[PDB]
Write an enzyme that holds these catalytic residues in place. Structure first.
Site, PDB file in Angstrom:
ATOM      1  N   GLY A 102       0.824  -1.286   0.078  1.00 48.18           N
ATOM      2  CA  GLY A 102       0.101   0.100  -0.036  1.00 48.18           C
ATOM      3  C   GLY A 102       0.633   1.184   0.079  1.00 48.18           C
ATOM      4  O   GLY A 102       0.095   2.106  -0.419  1.00 48.18           O
ATOM      5  N   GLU A 103       2.234   1.178   0.472  1.00 56.31           N
ATOM      6  CA  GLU A 103       2.781   2.614   0.713  1.00 56.31           C
ATOM      7  C   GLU A 103       3.434   2.962  -0.741  1.00 56.31           C
ATOM      8  O   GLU A 103       4.051   2.203  -1.446  1.00 56.31           O
ATOM      9  CB  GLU A 103       3.926   2.150   1.650  1.00 56.31           C
ATOM     10  CG  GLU A 103       3.480   1.954   3.134  1.00 56.31           C
ATOM     11  CD  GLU A 103       3.425   0.282   3.354  1.00 56.31           C
ATOM     12  OE1 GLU A 103       3.324  -0.475   2.263  1.00 56.31           O
ATOM     13  OE2 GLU A 103       3.129   0.048   4.495  1.00 56.31           O
ATOM     14  N   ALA A 104       3.168   4.115  -0.928  1.00 57.81           N
ATOM     15  CA  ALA A 104       3.564   5.020  -1.957  1.00 57.81           C
ATOM     16  C   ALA A 104       5.012   4.568  -2.801  1.00 57.81           C
ATOM     17  O   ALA A 104       5.294   4.488  -3.599  1.00 57.81           O
ATOM     18  CB  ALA A 104       3.290   6.548  -2.020  1.00 57.81           C
ATOM     19  N   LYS A 106       7.037   2.362  -1.937  1.00 56.41           N
ATOM     20  CA  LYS A 106       7.387   0.967  -2.296  1.00 56.41           C
ATOM     21  C   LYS A 106       6.867   0.537  -3.675  1.00 56.41           C
ATOM     22  O   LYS A 106       7.438  -0.024  -4.522  1.00 56.41           O
ATOM     23  CB  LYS A 106       6.713   0.128  -1.096  1.00 56.41           C
ATOM     24  CG  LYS A 106       7.002   0.163   0.243  1.00 56.41           C
ATOM     25  CD  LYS A 106       6.361  -0.860   1.013  1.00 56.41           C
ATOM     26  CE  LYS A 106       6.831  -0.737   2.570  1.00 56.41           C
ATOM     27  NZ  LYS A 106       8.281  -0.952   3.107  1.00 56.41           N
TER      28      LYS A 106
END
Length: 192
Positions: A102-104, A106
């Site tokens: 979910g993390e931008a 990544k």
């Protein structure tokens, strides 16, 4: 010998379950028990085969910031063969192999690696890897727009073309390329 083999087979199965709970601990167990070699390529091959592995857990491991995980991500993307595939065909294969975290930051690393690999495999298509990166997100966004009923108004081809003007080193992509990508998504959503 047989007892050692049977024990190792069960420990491998345990290692997969451990990985799904926490990827780093799973890999640690497999490495420490000599079930998996601790090299970026061997870890990547293990994840690419994906036997009994949760695809969200695969993405979690691939998204870690430390050196080894970055190297595994690179090796994992290198196992994908995109030569003579269009961008949508390549994305289908890539996105099936794991679930993006979910993390931008990544997702950015993962999609940049994808774009670089796509362009290396198909040197004549995009002269700029930025073009490939931006268009890859355009395709993902189009899939949502066309196939999620939450999105009420469906973008036509003409709109898809207009949305992507100027990203081909200041020019436009060939209209036929955009049409082919649009039609591919329209006719077949990304697999769920």
């Amino acid at each position: 010998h047989m007892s050692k083999t049977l024990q190792r087979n069960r420990k491998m199965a345990m290692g997969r379950k451990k990985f799904n709970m926490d990827p780093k601990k799973g890999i640690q167990f497999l490495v420490e028990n000599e079930l998996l070699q601790n090299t970026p390529e061997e870890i990547a091959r293990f994840l690419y085969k994906g036997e009994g592995l949760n695809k969200t857990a695969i993405g979690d491991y691939l998204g870690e910031r430390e050196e080894l995980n970055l190297a595994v991500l690179h090796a994992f993307v290198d196992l994908h063969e995109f030569t003579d595939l269009n961008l949508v065909q390549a994305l289908r294969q890539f996105l099936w192999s794991f679930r993006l975290p979910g993390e931008a930051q990544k997702i950015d690393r993962m999609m940049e690696a994808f774009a670089q690999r796509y362009c290396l495999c198909n040197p004549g298509v995009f002269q700029s890897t930025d073009t490939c990166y931006v268009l890859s997100f355009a395709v993902i966004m189009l899939n949502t727009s066309l196939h999620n009923p939450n999105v009420r108004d469906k973008p036509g081809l003409e709109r898809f073309v207009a949305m992507n003007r100027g990203i081909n080193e200041g020019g436009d992509l060939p209209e036929e390329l955009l049409r082919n990508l649009y039609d591919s998504i329209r006719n077949e959503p990304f697999k769920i």
